[PDB]
Amino acid sequence: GLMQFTLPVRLCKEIELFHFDIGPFENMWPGIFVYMVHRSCGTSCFELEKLCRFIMSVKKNYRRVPYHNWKHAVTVAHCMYAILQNNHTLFTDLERKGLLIACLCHDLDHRGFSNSYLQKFDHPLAALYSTSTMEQHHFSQTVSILQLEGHNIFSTLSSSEYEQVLEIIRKAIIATDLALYFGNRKQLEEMYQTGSLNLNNQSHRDRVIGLMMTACDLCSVTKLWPVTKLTANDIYAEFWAEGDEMKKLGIQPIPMMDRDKKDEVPQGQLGFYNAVAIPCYTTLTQILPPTEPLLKACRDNLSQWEKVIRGEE
Template sequence: ICNMMNAPADEYFTFQKGPVDETGWVIKNVLSLPIVNKKEDIVGVATFYNRKDGKPFDEHDEYITETLTQFLGWSLLNTDTYDKMNKLENRKDIAQEMLMNQTKATPEEIKSILKFQEKLNVDVIDDCEEKQLVAILKEDLPDPRSAELYEFRFSDFPITEHGLIQCGIRLFFEINVVEKFKVPVEVLTRWMYTVRKGYRAVTYHNWRHGFNVGQTMFTLLMTGRLKKYYTDLEAFAMLAAAFCHDIDHRGTNNLYQMKSTSPLARLHGSSILERHHLEYSKTLLQDESLNIFQNLNKRQFETVIHLFEVAIIATDLALYFKKRTMFQKIVDACEQMQTEEEAIKYVTVDPTKKEIIMAMMMTACDLSAITKPWEVQSQVALMVANEFWEQGDLERTVLQQQPIPMMDRNKRDELPKLQVGFIDFVCTFVYKEFSRFHKEITPMLSGLQNNRVEWKSLADEYDAKMKVIEEEAKKQEEGAEKAAEDSGGADDKKSKTCLML
């Protein structure tokens, strides 16, 4: 702080002795302070001349001006930070545009499903009427019954990834939301294809898994008759969210994101991957050419976004365990009711109950591979295991940590035992309660129980094999010990105190 109480008499102020200007204004006293940034660099100087009362600046003035210069420093910092934030925002927009350019369905990809050029002999899709596009699209979509889209036992194995896109579009027609909410079929096709491209080519959490979760959501709503608790708009949002629930999955779980301090982990504090899937899904809807909800009013669209948040975040199994008791209470209450109408009213009047059921539906969909016929489940389980083992390899090599048994490919023989444990401690509850809630969902519980028998048989077979190996090893060890005793027996009979010659 520089405080000149009598500036003209100060030896450092010789450059200004007389009046400053023609008005005769003279500098009598000066208070000057530096303005510094967060790095303590001087970025400016604040100087004050001549107190109004004619007295020199005192300690109180110094305190006030020091506080002021701190504020000025922060103001400059905020301006700098604002500029940096603007640049970061611009960079993000550019990166997002680049990403969208790579993942968004191209016109040629849309034509592979919506064959307007071939069937209507029209070069530009804008020249087609919406009714014409709907008609030609529905002609090429698979029959839902022959594709078993209404069945809990549905398998994606016989269907190509391109065919699954068509199946996905078919499901939106089956729940009657395309016409009701005026969804342009070009936009629906582009969105569905773009969602497929948004899934990475990882071992398990890929587009096939994303589609299976969407198909199971559809089956729970329609075949499982859970649709009666939800409006058409809610069903529309739930189905779309189910398709998107694992979009851009990296093949590693939340714990790995935290251990590796990935950018996702630094961005999201909890439910790391789930929040990323949600943000990715919302980003797609910000593009009008991908927004399948574009003809909703503001309130309806806000409802959809809220349901996306509830549904996608619910796929974090850590949250599933917290909500199980609440779901069980709903099932208990409905079981006591005399009529279906009474149960519907009990659920629908309370948005929280609907969201709890929806969250459990997402878990049931996400884990549904465990309920499929054994020939499907056994193959899918190996895909899941392989993805886990790949993460275990990363933990061992990149993080230099020993993976847990589930992630350790050196313990792959323990897979049947791990599957039995997974069924017992994670899966059984949700399918048992849904079967109690709606008997139409019982096939999922039956499939789960059948698969448990298969996995338990393999686990018992492995345990029996290990028991034989352990017993054989024990026999060999005992034999070696006995042989050692026998070979040392003669020496034991000799005197320890004298030697006979």
């Protein structure tokens, strides 16, 4: 109980920053997550034995894919940690608890393929879950692990609190379906601009948490340029494999998934920053001003992609 996780001095300091990279030492990532839970939530939020058993079972249910892997899970949890720590008073005890767990679990059992590829392949998951196919799967996997013997980190919660935290996690994980982000941000933009935004309105809070989930999920675009650039290679390794699998179904893939259109990556990144990332962090900064460093880091990376196009790199 008087047992803190401690990090080396450079990590202790840099983990507080939005652009922190969790490093290449896989064996430190569980400790990095527990450290963030302890500071974000409290050393009391979870029984350490159950938490450690939960974390190791979550890790085991991430696959050895180039990008949608255990490192992505802990990376997305860290961005959520940074948002929560910079917005101390805005979130409930249940929300702090639920949201770090939601982030760790949000891509459980990902195969490196989009909802669209599952649909075209006619994968069994696409018949079970007609929309947000992988995201409904990720939530199902989260519940399955929570129900393993000795894995119920939420055991000390009252029945009502338990039902509330699972509903926070479910909504948070479904919100990582990027297809749903466009309409969520549009509604939040209108609400902010007309001054109707009310954080006491549960349906408004749901929308704000949804945007936080998009922001943490896309956080590779908010790292220092060398991290952003090297992460893009892992993302494209998955996209191009999916494109190969589309060609095997006799379907021409979209250019972003076609390894033959590698040359159009820089312009593709520009479209993504302008259509998704920048708008996402802009609306997040309007609602939660202390998240401005994410928007600043995103604009810096946009200007690096612009320099790549101009042959300056």
